[PDB]
Nucleic acid binder design. Structure first.
Lengths: 256, 351, 254, 254
DNA sequence: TAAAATATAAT
DNA sequence: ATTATATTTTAAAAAATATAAATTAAAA
DNA sequence: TTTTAATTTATATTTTT
C-alpha cells in the first residue's frame, strides 16, 4: 500500500549510516503525511526523531498507516548496495513481511530489487513537547563532528557550557582537559560557517561523548547542526535537511 | 525454575532484550551473591588445584568477584550483593536432596582419584563445591572494603532481590535463575559477566512484558512456575512447559486445575504443597527494603591490600591497578536516563 | 635464460594482487609463446588460467618450457615493491632456481633487483576442454565488482539468470533477497558503459560468492569483464589484460 | 611563563606522529634556544634527537631551562585534535605540571585549550659527539620510506652500501633477497626527486629494518632524508624540518 | 543454578 | 508420528597476553 | 572512489595460585 520513489540514494544512505550503530533495530511509522521514526536507544539514553516529509519523496503514496520493524544493520547493509545517485523506491504491499528497496541507476541501465525481510517489533514512543530551548547553537556539521572526535580521545564525557561569549566544549580524562571554545560569528554568516547562538540563559551540562560520536555520523546529511539545550532538558542535535524533515538526536545529560 | 527461560525464549521473545554490558552506565542492580560465589568457585579452577593460597585458604571467589565488581563499576553498574541466609523449609528437603547428590558425587570420587583419571577429578572437584559461612564472611568483608553494599537476607535471597526491585530501590536483579521473575521482580538480569561482552550478552527479562504478552498476572505466573517445575515444591508429572502455558492460558488459578484434571491422565503428587509454595513465592520472609539504605563508599586502599593480598599472598600492582580503576570509575558523573525526562505517551507495534 | 620486460608493470602488480587470495602456491608455465598459469585454488573449487602472450612483452626471450614453483604471497609481496609506472623484468637462469624481478624506474633512477626462491611443487595442470558458451555477456567490470560486492552482504549464493532481455543476479539470504537486473546498453560498445549479450538459450545457475569476490579482486586488469556460462558448466570470468593476455576464472556451479 | 606560538603547527603534529611510536615517554628539554628532545628507544636501541629552534616559532618566550616529561602517546592524541593549519601556542607554568596547548583556527573562532599531565622523570644524557661523517646521502622522503617499507616485507635487516655510482639497500630473508640501487641525479630539483651523495670511503652497514620503519614516520616533515654514516658508527637519519629544526634518528648498526 | 541429547511417551 | 517430556549428562571466570582480523578514519 | 595504515576488536592462548 506504500510506495515512495525518492530520486537520490544519498539521503537514505546517510540516514542509515547515521542509524546503523547508535540503534540496532527500529520501527518506522509511515503515514500519508510522511515517514517518521521515533526510535529509542537500547542504552536508554538516546532518542532519534527522524522525519522525512511526504513532499520530500518525489513520488509518494500510502493508503493506510503502517509500522514496519526492521533491523537497521540489515537495512544499512542493503542500502549500502545503492550508489550515491541511485533512485530508491520503497515499496510495502498488503501483509507486509518484506520491504522492497528498488535502486534505479540514473543512466537507466541497472535496476536492483531487494526484498528485505521484516520482523515483529514493539518499540515504545516517547513524548516530545514543542518547547522553547535556553541555548540554541547552529554549527557547521563537520566542525561539530570534529569537536566530538577530538574530545573523544581526551575523556568519556563532555561539558558543554553556553554563554554570550560563545560555546565551550570541555573534556577531562587521563590525558588532561581540553576546552574547545567557539565564538558566534556574526560577521561571517554564510551557509557552511554559520555559528549562531540563540541565548536565553547560560547553561552548563555534562553529556556522554560516545553517544555524541554516534550522533555525529549524521554529518554528511546536512552542513548545519542545531544543538538545542535547556539547563536540565536533554539536548537536541538536529540535522535539518533542506529537502525533507529532520534527524533530531535527543541525549540525556549527566547529573552530579 | 526448570525451563522458564527456554519457555520465554520460545513463546514471548520480545520480553527478552539482548543488551550490552556497557550500555547502562549508572544502573542500580541487586546481585545474588551465592550464585556468583559458586561461579567463582567452579570456573576459576586451573585443573586439580583450587586456586587457593600457600596456606590452603580458598580465595578464588574473592579475586573473581573482585575483578567482576571492578568491571561493573567500570561499565557503570552499581551492584548490591544480596547474600543468602536461612532457606525456607520447603527447600530444606530439596537442598538436602541436592546435598545427597553431592554425596553421590562423593561416591563417584572413589572412581575419580583411585583410578587416576585427572579429567574426572577436575569434573567432580567442580561438583563438590559448597558455599560456607567462611566464604560468605570473607566476601562480605571484601565488599566492606570495596564499599559495595551487602545484604544478608533472612530468607532465600532471590526473593530479597525481587523485594529490592519491587521497592523501586534497584532497577534489576542479577540472579541468573528464573526464581526472581516468579518472586515478583519486574526486571531481571542474566549472564551479567565482565569479560564475555558478546559471547554471553546480557539477557534482560521484563516481567511486565511477560505478563502482557502471556495474558497473565502474578498469581497465575506463580502457578505457572509451580506446574512447569519449581524449586520449592514438586510439580505434576504429566505437565511440562508447553502444557503449562496451554493450561494456564485457558484456566487461571491452580484450584480449578487441581480439581478438573483427572488422576488417570495427569496424576497429582501424593504430597501436594502448592498452596504453601504459592505463599512462599507470593509473600516471602524478605527483609525490610526501606530499613536499609544503599550507600556506595570509596574503597579503602591499604586495608584492601592488607586483607586482599596480605594473607591471600597475591600480587600488588594488579590489585592496586584494579582499585585505582574502581576509584576512577566511581568518582564521576552519573549518567541520566531518558525515561526520566520524556514520558512514554504510547507504544508502537509493527503491524 | 628467461627474460621478460614489461613497461606497464602495474599490469603484473594487478595480476599478483588478483591471484593472491585464491592461489597460495602456483606453477607458472613459461614457454616461447609466453606466460601461462593453469592452477587450481587452495580449497579446490575454482580454476585459474592466466595467459600473457609474448607480443605484449616489450622484450621476451625464453628457451625451454620452464616450470616455476612460486609462492604467490611471496610474489605479491615482491611485486608490491614496484610502483604503478615501474618497468618489471622477469629473469631466470637455467642453473639457478630463483626468479629475479628487476624494477626500472620510469625516469630510470631507482633500479630494484629482487630475487625470489622457487619451491618444488606438484603439476596441477589437468587442462580444460573449451566450450561454445551459450550465455556470453561482455559487461563492465566495475559494475560486476559492485554486484558481487553488494550481493555478498546477503548470502553466499548468486543465481545468475541470463536471457535476451537482461541478466539477473539474485541472492537470497538470512537478511533479504537481492535482485540486480542489467539490460543491454546501446552506447556504441564503450569500454566502461557497455553490457553486450550474446545468446543461445536462457540459462540459470547458482554460484558461490567467496570465490566470486576472489574473482572481483581481478577487476583493475580490465574495465570490461566477460562472463560465459552454459548448461552445468563452470562459469568463465574472463579479464582481457590490455590486449596482451587474458585471465580466465572457472567456477564450478553450486 | 613559557610561550611557543607557531602559525602552522602541522610541523608539531608530524613530529608527534613521527616519534609517538618509538618512545612511550620522553623529556622535552625546553630552553631559550628552543626544544631539544634527546632520548632513546623504548627497547633502548635507537636514539631520537629532536631540535626545534626558536627562530621558526613565531612568538617564542622562555625564561627557565625546563625539562618536562611528556607522555608522547598522550601528546600525540592531544595533537590529533589540531588540524593541519592551526596556530599552535604551547603554554607552560613554572609551578604547575600542566602543558597547555592552544589551537587557533584560520577562521579565528575555534579556540582549543588542551592541558597535559606531565612527569618529572630524568633520563640520562647520552650526548653523542659530532664527527666528520664519511658517507652522506640526501634522498626524497617518499623514496626512502618506500625503500624501508618494501624491504621490510623481505627481512629484518638491510645492508646499505654507498659508492661513486650510488647507494644500494640490500635485504635478505626467507622471502628471498632484494637489491635497490639509486644513482645520483643530475640536479633535476633542489628538494623534489633528487638524490645527492657525498663520499669519503666505501663502506657497507647492516641495520635493523623495523627501527627504520619507525624512522620513516618522519617522512611528511621534510622532503629530504639525509642519511649519514661511516665505519662502525650509528646511522644518522636527518630531517631538516622546513629550515627551522632537525630530527635526527640514530641507529646502531648490527 | 543453567542447557542440551536422546530414549520415551501421549496427545 | 512429530510433538513434548522427562530422563541421562555436560556446564558456570577474568584477568593480559600476543596475534590475527574487520572495520573506520585518514590520505590520496 | 581506493587503498593503506593504523585502530581497535573479537578470538584464543596462558597463568590468576
Amino acid at each position: 500500500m506504500f510506495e515512495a520513489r525518492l530520486v537520490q540514494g544519498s539521503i537514505l544512505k546517510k540516514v542509515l549510516e547515521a542509524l546503523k550503530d547508535l540503534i540496532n533495530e527500529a520501527c518506522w511509522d509511515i503515514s500519508s503525511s510522511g515517514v517518521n521514526l521515533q526510535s529509542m536507544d537500547s542504552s536508554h539514553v538516546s532518542l532519534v526523531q527522524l522525519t522525512l516529509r511526504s513532499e520530500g519523496f518525489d513520488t509518494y503514496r500510502c493508503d493506510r498507516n503502517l509500522a514496519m520493524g526492521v533491523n537497521l544493520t540489515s537495512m544499512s547493509k542493503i542500502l549500502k548496495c545503492a550508489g550515491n545517485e541511485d533512485i530508491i523506491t520503497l515499496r510495502a504491499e498488503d501483509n507486509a513481511d518484506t520491504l522492497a528497496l528498488v535502486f534505479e541507476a540514473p543512466n537507466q541501465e541497472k535496476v536492483s530489487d531487494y526484498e528485505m525481510k521484516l520482523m515483529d517489533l514493539d518499540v515504545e514512543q516517547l513524548g516530545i513537547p514543542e518547547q522553547e530551548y535556553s541555548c540554541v547553537v547552529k554549527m557547521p556539521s563537520g566542525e561539530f563532528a570534529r569537536i566530538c572526535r577530538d574530545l573523544s580521545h581526551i575523556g568519556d564525557a563532555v561539558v558543554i557550557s553556553c554563554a554570550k561569549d560563545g560555546v565551550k566544549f570541555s573534556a577531562s580524562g587521563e590525558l588532561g582537559n581540553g576546552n574547545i571554545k567557539l565564538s558566534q560569528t556574526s560577521n561571517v554568516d554564510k551557509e557552511e560557517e554559520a555559528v549562531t547562538i540563540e541565548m536565553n540563559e547560560p547553561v552548563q551540562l555534562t553529556f556522554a561523548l560516545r553517544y555524541l560520536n554516534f550522533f555525529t555520523k549524521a554529518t554528511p546529511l546536512s552542513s548545519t547542526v542545531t544543538l538545542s539545550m535547556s539547563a536540565d532538558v536533554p539536548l537536541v542535535v538536529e540535522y535539518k535537511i533542506a529537502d525533507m524533515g529532520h534527524l533530531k538526536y535527543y541525549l540525556a545529560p549527566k547529573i552530579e | 525454575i526448570q525451563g522458564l527461560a527456554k519457555l520465554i525464549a520460545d513463546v514471548a521473545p520480545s520480553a527478552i532484550r539482548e543488551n550490552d554490558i556497557k550500555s547502562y552506565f549508572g544502573r542500580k542492580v541487586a546481585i545474588d551473591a551465592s550464585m556468583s560465589i559458586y561461579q567463582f568457585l567452579i570456573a576459576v579452577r586451573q585443573g586439580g588445584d583450587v586456586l587457593q593460597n600457600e596456606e590452603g585458604e580458598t580465595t578464588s571467589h574473592l579475586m573473581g568477584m573482585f575483578y567482576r565488581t571492578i568491571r561493573m563499576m567500570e561499565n557503570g553498574i552499581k551492584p548490591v550483593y544480596v547474600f543468602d541466609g536461612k532457606p525456607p523449609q520447603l527447600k530444606s528437603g530439596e537442598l538436602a536432596k541436592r546435598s545427597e547428590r553431592r554425596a553421590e558425587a562423593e561416591k563417584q570420587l572413589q572412581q575419580a582419584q583411585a583410578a587416576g583419571a585427572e579429567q574426572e577429578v577436575e569434573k567432580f572437584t567442580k561438583r563438590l563445591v559448597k558455599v560456607t559461612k567462611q566464604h560468605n564472611d570473607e566476601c562480605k568483608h571484601l565488599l566492606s572494603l570495596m564499599g559495595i553494599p551487602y545484604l544478608d537476607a533472612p530468607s532465600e535471597a532471590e526473593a530479597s532481590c525481587a523485594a529490592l526491585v519491587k521497592a523501586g530501590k534497584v532497577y534489576a536483579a542479577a540472579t541468573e535463575d528464573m526464581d526472581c521473575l516468579t518472586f515478583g521482580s519486574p526486571v531481571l538480569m542474566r549472564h551479567l559477566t565482565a569479560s564475555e561482552a558478546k559471547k554471553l550478552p546480557i539477557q534482560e527479562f521484563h516481567l511486565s512484558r511477560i505478563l502482557q504478552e502471556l495474558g497473565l498476572n502474578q498469581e497465575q505466573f506463580v502457578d505457572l512456575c509451580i506446574l512447569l517445575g519449581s524449586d520449592y515444591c514438586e510439580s505434576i508429572r504429566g505437565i511440562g512447559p508447553k502444557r503449562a502455558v496451554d493450561l494456564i492460558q485457558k484456566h487461571k488459578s491452580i484450584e480449578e486445575i487441581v480439581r478438573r484434571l483427572d488422576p488417570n491422565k495427569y496424576p497429582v503428587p501424593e504430597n501436594w504443597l502448592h498452596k504453601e509454595a504459592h505463599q512462599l513465592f507470593l509473600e516471602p520472609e524478605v527483609l525490610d527494603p526501606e530499613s536499609v539504605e544503599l550507600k556506595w563508599s570509596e574503597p579503602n586502599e591499604e586495608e584492601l591490600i592488607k586483607f586482599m593480598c596480605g594473607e591471600k599472598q597475591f600480587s600488588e600492582e594488579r590489585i592496586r591497578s584494579g582499585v585505582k580503576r574502581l576509584s576512577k570509575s566511581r568518582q564521576g558523573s552519573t549518567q541520566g536516563r531518558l525515561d526520566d525526562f520524556f514520558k512514554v505517551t504510547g507504544s508502537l507495534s509493527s503491524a
